[PDB]
Design a protein around this ligand. Structure first.
Ligand SMILES: CCOC(=O)c1cncn1[C@H](C)c1ccccc1
Lengths: 105, 48, 120, 116, 80, 52
């Protein structure tokens, strides 16, 4: 079991600034951590597969930064609809997801 | 050279005159013979 | 996957595999590259008995020369010169194993310090 | 050629005066060292075989002869302190016994291994 | 002893564990090194006591072959 | 010195001219041989005149 500490647990940012989320694994997960966006009453939608690779239909403001253990997800100039839960999950082993970060305004 | 030294040491303390004589003679007999051998060898092998 | 009895490593010791996927760019296009690393860890067993043991033994043999009396010049001189010759032969032989790299390894530092001790 | 020349190099010590200890000890032990190196080379010539050939037999006999010369000088030096005339006679006895034994062994060996 | 070990090791691979012939050579080198250290001890305490040197020599003359034969028999019993 | 040279030459090929490392080894061996000849000269004239 590879545990993923996703930070911060809850953060609020206004509209129009670059926001950075972090997800640090325990063991090695080499560019195999995906980022999902779970809006309320909705199923998660894949945003960043691999380590930094936008899924077909993802805006150009979501972009990832990969490594062996620590990964980041940057949303430059968030809109009003970017408010959801953001879950990182590795797949180098059996998939284990992070606690998620609540995005508020 | 080693055999000459052995002979010198064998004659030392009993006939030191002969020992010193053959040592002073081998100080001239070995280098001249080596020079002659070198000249002969190199000459007869470079002429061909 | 690695087989159980599948290891012909005499000197190294396989720790584990580590896979990864990436995307490289060549002069013709953009390709997908699957990378796999095998983590190896060298075994010091041979180098100990073949370099560190003779170096330490030579240093000890050389420091034995101090316990002899000062009125014995040939013995102490022989001790010193033989230990230096041994250290030289060892410094030459041990370096022969590795590829001709331009930096100083750790074994070279050990050999240099032992040579300094013998010369001292 | 090098083996027999090493053996006569070892014999040279039988003429050096018995008072010079380091000279004779160096002669003997360095001759033993060169002898074992030459035996290593000679055996390295042909492949690994578990039987005794006619060449390594020769080099082993030469090694034994050098060993005998060294131990002979050792006993000579030990007996000099006890009784000098014993060692004085031992020197001239060895001077005749060593080359004779070597020549006899060479004759026997060459005859036995050539006409076979 | 060192050159014998060198001429031997040039043929074997680089194996980390200690072989049997390496154990034999280590034992022989320990015996030779103890002989040399015994002479050093004799030469150190020779000026202070001239009889201790003769005692140590007379003891070693019968002690070294005994320990060597014992080690030889133990080695040949453990390996054969 | 001759051991260093023999170890070094077993690697390089059969090459006629005098390389730079061969020149260094020849210079070091000349210095060593000159030290030995100096000692022989001192031992020759030691008994006659130790001041020189
Ligand atoms: C105290 C033991 O001494 C030594 O092992 C030692 C030190 N120099 C040489 N040797 C011996 C020959 C040796 C070295 C390596 C492997 C086997 C045998």
């Amino acid at each position: 079991n590879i545990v993923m500490t996703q930070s911060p647990k809850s953060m609020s940012m206004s509209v129009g600034e670059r926001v950075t989320l972090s997800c640090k694994a325990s063991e090695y997960v080499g560019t195999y951590v995906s980022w999902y966006q779970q809006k309320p009453e909705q199923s998660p939608k894949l945003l960043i597969y691999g380590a930094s690779n936008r899924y077909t239909g993802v805006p150009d403001r979501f972009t990832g930064s990969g490594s062996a253990t620590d990964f980041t997800l940057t949303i430059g100039s968030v809109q009003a609809e970017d408010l959801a839960d953001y879950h990182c999950g590795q797949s180098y082993s059996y998939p284990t997801f992070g606690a998620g970060t609540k995005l508020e305004l | 050279a080693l055999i000459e030294f052995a002979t010198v040491n064998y004659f030392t303390k009993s006939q030191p005159a002969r020992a010193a004589k053959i040592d002073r003679l081998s100080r001239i007999a070995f280098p001249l013979l080596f020079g002659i051998f070198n000249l002969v060898y190199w000459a007869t092998y470079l002429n061909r | 996957v690695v087989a159980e009895d599948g290891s012909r490593l005499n000197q190294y010791d396989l720790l584990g595999q580590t896979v990864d996927s990436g995307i490289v760019q060549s002069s013709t296009g953009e390709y997908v590259v699957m990378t796999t690393h095998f983590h190896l860890k060298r075994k010091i067993g041979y180098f100990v008995i073949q370099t560190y043991l003779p170096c330490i033994m030579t240093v000890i043999l050389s420091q034995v020369s101090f316990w002899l009396n000062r009125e014995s010049v040939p013995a102490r001189t022989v001790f010193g010169v033989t230990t230096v010759l041994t250290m030289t032969t060892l410094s030459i032989s041990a370096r022969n194993s590795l590829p001709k790299v331009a930096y100083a390894t750790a074994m070279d530092w050990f050999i240099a310090v032992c040579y300094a001790f013998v010369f001292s | 050629i090098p083996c027999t020349l090493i053996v006569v190099l070892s014999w040279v010590s039988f003429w050096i005066n018995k008072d010079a200890v380091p000279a004779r000890t160096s002669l003997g032990i360095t001759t033993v060292l060169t002898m074992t190196t030459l035996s290593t080379i000679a055996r390295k010539s042909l492949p690994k075989v578990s039987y005794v050939t006619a060449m390594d037999l020769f080099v082993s006999v030469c090694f034994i002869f050098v060993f005998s010369a060294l131990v002979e000088y050792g006993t000579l030096h030990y007996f000099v302190s006890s009784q000098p005339a014993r060692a004085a006679k031992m020197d001239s006895y060895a001077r005749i016994f060593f080359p004779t034994a070597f020549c006899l062994f060479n004759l026997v060996y060459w005859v036995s291994y050539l006409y076979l | 002893m060192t050159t014998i070990n060198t001429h031997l090791r040039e043929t074997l691979p680089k194996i980390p564990y200690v072989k049997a012939i390496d154990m034999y050579l280590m034992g022989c080198f320990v015996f030779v090194f103890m002989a040399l250290l015994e002479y050093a001890l004799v030469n150190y305490i020779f000026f202070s006591q001239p009889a201790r040197a003769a005692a140590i020599d007379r003891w070693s003359r019968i002690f070294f072959p005994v320990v060597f034969s014992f080690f030889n028999i133990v080695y040949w019993l453990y390996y054969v």
